Protein: Portal protein
Amino acid sequence: AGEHIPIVPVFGEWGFVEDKEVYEGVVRLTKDGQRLRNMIMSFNADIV
Amino acid sequence: AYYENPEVPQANAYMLEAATSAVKEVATLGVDTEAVNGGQVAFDTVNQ
Amino acid sequence: ARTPKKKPFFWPEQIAGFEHMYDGNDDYPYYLLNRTDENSGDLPTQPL
Structure:
């Protein structure tokens, strides 16, 4: 029944790397720093 | 003579410093205003 | 993750028959190594 596409995606910062799409929330590469802590946590648990 | 366990190397401690700073880095976009309208301001403008 | 960490060195001729005295569990409150060896005996000097 629309006269335009009724589906509106909301984005954070939105754009292209060059030609591939990329967008980010507040979680994008947050994943990196969590894994360093988890690394030390898993290894030292084995020592204990 | 008494058994000496791994005491957790200085390399592990150096990585803990890099780990704690990394996880909070992306996680906070940048608090513009305390409480409401924090790091979500970038999302809020494009959402409306 | 990868590196050997602080654990006692031994010789293969003084760790012979000891593998229940190291396992990472409490089956023991002490350790045992070979004090003397054939082809001139030995005495403890902390040989580890």
